[PDB]
């Protein structure tokens, strides 16, 4: 996948984490991307490995 | 009535809520604690 710059690989899944209206993505301790927001529909999706 | 502060390069410790909001902070150059 590529989300407006974020390049990665994995399974995408519907989220339930309330991304504050201003948070582009989700950051995990040890600093790996684990959630994104879809630019077009603006919904949060988890990125499992 | 209005105020004017200025900004300097500091190092802080921000506490994040479970919704993802900053609820508390620590300025790491205040005292020994």
């Amino acid at each position: 996948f590529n989300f407006n710059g974020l390049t990665g690989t994995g399974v995408l899944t519907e989220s339930n984490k309330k991304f504050l209206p201003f948070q582009q993505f989700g950051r995990d301790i040890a600093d790996t991307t684990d959630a994104v927001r879809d630019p077009q529909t603006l919904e949060i999706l988890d990125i499992t490995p | 009535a209005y105020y004017v502060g200025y900004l300097q390069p500091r190092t802080f410790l921000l506490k994040y809520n479970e919704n993802g909001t900053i609820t508390d902070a620590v300025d790491c150059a205040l005292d020994p604690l």
């Binding site: 991304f19 201003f22 993505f25 959630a35 | 502060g5 994040y16 479970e18 900053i22 902070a25």
Partner: peptide
């Protein structure tokens, strides 16, 4: 006059989310 802020002027350094992570 001059006054004392107490804990004021904290902004979100950027986008990105975060849960319970002392960043």
């Amino acid at each position: 006059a001059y006054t004392n802020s107490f804990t004021r002027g904290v902004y979100y350094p950027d986008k990105v989310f975060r849960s319970s992570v002392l960043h």
